[PDB]
Amino acid sequence: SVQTAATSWGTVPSIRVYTANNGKITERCWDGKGWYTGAFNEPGDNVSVTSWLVGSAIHIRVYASTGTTTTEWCWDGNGWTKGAYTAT
Amino acid sequence: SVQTAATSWGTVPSIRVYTANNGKITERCWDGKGWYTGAFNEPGDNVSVTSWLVGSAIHIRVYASTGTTTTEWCWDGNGWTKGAYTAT
Amino acid sequence: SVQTAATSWGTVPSIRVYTANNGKITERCWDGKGWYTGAFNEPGDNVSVTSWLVGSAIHIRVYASTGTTTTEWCWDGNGWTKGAYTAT
Ligand SMILES: OC[C@@]1(O)OC[C@@H](O)[C@@H](O)[C@@H]1O
Ligand SMILES: OC[C@@]1(O)OC[C@@H](O)[C@@H](O)[C@@H]1O
Ligand SMILES: OC[C@@]1(O)OC[C@@H](O)[C@@H](O)[C@@H]1O
Ligand SMILES: OC[C@@]1(O)OC[C@@H](O)[C@@H](O)[C@@H]1O
Ligand SMILES: OC[C@@]1(O)OC[C@@H](O)[C@@H](O)[C@@H]1O
Ligand SMILES: OC[C@@]1(O)OC[C@@H](O)[C@@H](O)[C@@H]1O
């Protein structure tokens, strides 16, 4: 079936749910006022996530895996880009 | 194999581990004094979870997936019910 | 594909990413100065993780599953050992 990963922050809260479905990962977002589709859209068969809130900034790390390759995607306030993570 | 998801809160801590096994999700609970089987029992092949503790209240969201359908289950102090999440 | 689980703590942050790949779980670690391979290496086809930071101590629980058996692995400052979790 589809595979999901979830994270949340604050007291509203904000929630992010990532779904790997048919080799693509998409993102659904809640900030207290309805679910919406987030900016994150990248390939992957499996997803995990962690996040940490510091001051006014949310930092999110999404680990997207296809085959034996895992790509880290980073949100630090300015869109999603690949991070330095490697699996070694 | 079976697939799990875990969350924890406080300093004891309380831990919740959700296991999707043979199309059913069950819940094991630790509150500092032994593991026990929790109230959560719903269908699903895949599970993720997030939780947030505010004051005296734990809020838990469990995302249960079968095929391409994901159901959000909500704990807000008074049993588990379906939440408004949709995958779009 | 490979399956991952992630957790993080503090403001640096420290991040731990567990990967189940070909029946083995390994751990990659970030403490602010590059990724490295962690001490955790145990069998499993599926992994989840939760952690909680209290004072100067990180506590990590990794749930490693093969078939219908889930083993809890505990970090409490002094290496990884099996915890009391059972699935019942
Ligand atoms: O729209 C809200 C948003 O910016 O929140 C942070 C990330 O989750 C983004 O992908 C998302 O679009
Ligand atoms: O700011 C991005 C970054 O440095 O954040 C910490 C880790 O997630 C790294 O892999 C990543 O490149
Ligand atoms: O028994 C403890 C309990 O109420 O804690 C909150 C939820 O995890 C419930 O499913 C669980 O039964
Ligand atoms: O109180 C329940 C609820 O509003 O909590 C926030 C989100 O999890 C929603 O999908 C959900 O319906
Ligand atoms: O090296 C850092 C380390 O000690 O951090 C705590 C655990 O994640 C360990 O497996 C890891 O080796
Ligand atoms: O200190 C280890 C331990 O007591 O921590 C809390 C739970 O993770 C238990 O299963 C585990 O044996």
UniProtKB/TrEMBL annotation, chains A, B, C:
Zn(2+) 1 binds at residue 45. Pfam families: Fungal_lectin. GO terms for molecular function: carbohydrate binding; metal ion binding. Zn(2+) 5 binds at residue 59. SUPFAM superfamilies: Fucose-specific lectin. It comes from Ralstonia solanacearum. This is Fucose-binding lectin protein. InterPro entries: Fungal_lectin. Zn(2+) 4 binds at residue 45. Zn(2+) 3 binds at residue 45. Keywords: Lectin, Metal-binding, Zinc. Mg(2+) binds at residue 6. The modification N6,N6-dimethyllysine is found at residues 24, 33, 69, 82.
